[PDB]
With several copies, the nearest count.
Chain A
Amino acid sequence: SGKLRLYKEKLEGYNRFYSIVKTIKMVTLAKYRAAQGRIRTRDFSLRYTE
């Protein structure tokens, strides 16, 4: 019927949304890790600024 197909389409859209958000998570984690290098190189530039 239509209502059954309505729920099927809604579930498919949610699955697409979940996949896109997962890709966003992966991309953000890539930059989190990529710009995680700052942690090693911080906490020494601002010494006489204190």
Chain B
Amino acid sequence: ADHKGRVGHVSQVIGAVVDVHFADGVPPVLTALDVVDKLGRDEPLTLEIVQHLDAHTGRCIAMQTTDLLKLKAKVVSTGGNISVPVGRETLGRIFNVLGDAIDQRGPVGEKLRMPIHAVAPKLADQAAEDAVLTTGIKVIDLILPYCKGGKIGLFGGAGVGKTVIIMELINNVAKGHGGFSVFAGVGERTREGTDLYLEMMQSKVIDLKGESKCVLVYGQMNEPPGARARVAQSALTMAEYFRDVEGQDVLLFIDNIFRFTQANSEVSALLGRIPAAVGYQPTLAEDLGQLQERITSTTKGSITSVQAVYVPADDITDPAPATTFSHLDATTVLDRAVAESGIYPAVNPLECASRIMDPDVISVDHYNVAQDVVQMLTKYRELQDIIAVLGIDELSEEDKLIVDRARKLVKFLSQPFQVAEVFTGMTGHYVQLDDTIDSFSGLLMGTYDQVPEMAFYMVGGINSVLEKAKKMAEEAAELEKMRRAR
């Protein structure tokens, strides 16, 4: 506060690292500085203090290109850390690290701003008990339920409808829990950012003429590493505002969490720090800790983060994914083979995992049903192998029933999302948690042993299954009646 508007001069420029000399003393670390001299630059230049070299000189990292930057160039402190607009006015808008609307859709008109760097919640602010986050998706709610304040590792690249699942989650969290979402693109392709923005505008999750339910904060690849290491923190600050002031269950999407680590590693390398094993920055654990620890469920609200994880060189023991997995509370794996089979969302139930899959957290019936489904799916894989070796007719009576029930389960785990109504043309379904538990429990016992297998394909709940079965029966009866006439 006492260093608001303090004057300094540029003392050294080596690439993206700029040293600023202050006659009155360097401001506190992580302080944002503005280069008043825009002589020939096409964009404003802002520096972030990262280190103190002496009582008067301080090293900084530039957020934009340092071209046309001379020594002794005047620099003015902003009075604190980087400030980002937070509020309900940021919904449906695209921001950058500095919290500037890059969508060219008029002024933001925010009423308050918050610093990018905020201490994580204290031990006294932690939630009293773990709670499930009903996403409205049968597969997630049943096999790998999400927890409020938890981190979910979303595996599987493009081609498996990853964006569709993200949009469905954004819609469902607002529909059921009434909480907003914040999407952070860290080191993302600019083309893919445009595609995601267009898709969101098309699905009405970002209504220009109405009310939006998502905030976009994009740090693109072409930007220097100083911005890709802070865009995630800016998005997290935006989410924290909703979590605390409004007390909501917010969502925070990171695409990807590996890009964040890469940007931090590059920034550390520029400063000249000795890289650790493999070559990541020595503060790799601390960098991820200062970010993930801020994502938790407090007594006011919660922030559940769905982070897309990338495994470099397909090495699961690499320090980056290895350190990341220490903070993940769940894992949603997307496979192309499942998608090619006509199952959407393309989720591999036996490859996913979750820590709240315990009776101490979820209801005992939920845990029993989930374990039974997993066991039946595993037995179905074994029986599929057996029949592929010997044949279907070699299976015993129990094995045949298990195969039929497992096929119904596999067909029953698919679901149409409301976000895809325009394209698929069929109404989406939002299945309640208890409804899914009851439906799967009934199916496992064998109550629905007469319903045709295809009645479970792309339906929500058990009532939808009955309606589809009745419609199929009526269609078959009409076709048979018409055939008898001719």
User: Hey, which bits of chain A sit against chain B, CB under 8 A?
Assistant: 1-2, 5, 29, 33
CB nearest neighbor in B for A3: B315
Q: Are B389 and A2 in contact (CB under 8 A)?
A: no
List of B residues within 8 angstroms of A2 by Cβ: 313-315, 317
Q: Which residues of A contact B313 (CB under 8 A)?
A: 2
Q: Are B317 and A5 in touch, CB under 8 angstroms?
A: yes
Contact digits for B380-410, partner A, Cβ 8 Å, 1 yes 0 no: 0000000001010000000000000000000
Residues of B with C-beta under 8 A to A29: 389
On B, residues with C-beta under 8 Å from A are 313-315, 317, 389, 391
Known pairs A2-B314, A5-B317; list 7 more (Cβ under 8 Å): A1-B315, A1-B317, A2-B315, A2-B317, A5-B315, A29-B389, A33-B391
Give the chain B neighbours of A1 by CB distance below 8 A.
315, 317
CA distance A5 to B313 in the complex (A): 13
Question: Lowest 6 A-B CB distances belong to which pairs?
Answer: A2-B315, A2-B313, A29-B389, A5-B317, A1-B315, A2-B314
A5 to B316 Cα, complex, angstroms: 11
Q: Chain B residues near A33 (CB, 8 Å)?
A: 391
Q: Which residue of A lies closest to B391 (CB)?
A: A33
Per the bound structure, the CA–CA distance linking A2 and B313 in Å amounts to: 8
Can you name the residue of chain A whose Cβ is closest to the Cβ of B314? Answer: A2
Chain A residues, Cβ within 8 Å of B315: 1-2, 5
User: How many whole Å from A5's CB to the nearest CB in chain B?
Assistant: 7
Q: Can you report 10 residue pairs joining A to B where beta carbons are below 8 Å apart?
A: A1-B315, A1-B317, A2-B313, A2-B314, A2-B315, A2-B317, A5-B315, A5-B317, A29-B389, A33-B391
Closest B residue to A5 by beta carbon equals: B317
Shortest distance in angstroms between A9's beta carbon and chain B's nearest beta carbon? 12
Which of chain A's residues have a CB closer than 8 A to the CB of B391?
Answer: 33
A17 to chain B, nearest CB (A): 19
Quote the shortest CB–CB distance from B307 to chain A (angstroms): 23
Residue of A nearest to B278 (CB): A1
- Nearest B residue to A29 via CB reads B389
Q: Determine how close the nearest CB of chain B comes to the CB of A3; give it in whole angstroms.
A: 10
Q: How far is the CB of B278 from chain A (nearest CB, A)?
A: 8
Most chain B CB within a 10 A radius of its CB, from A2, A5, A29, A33: A2
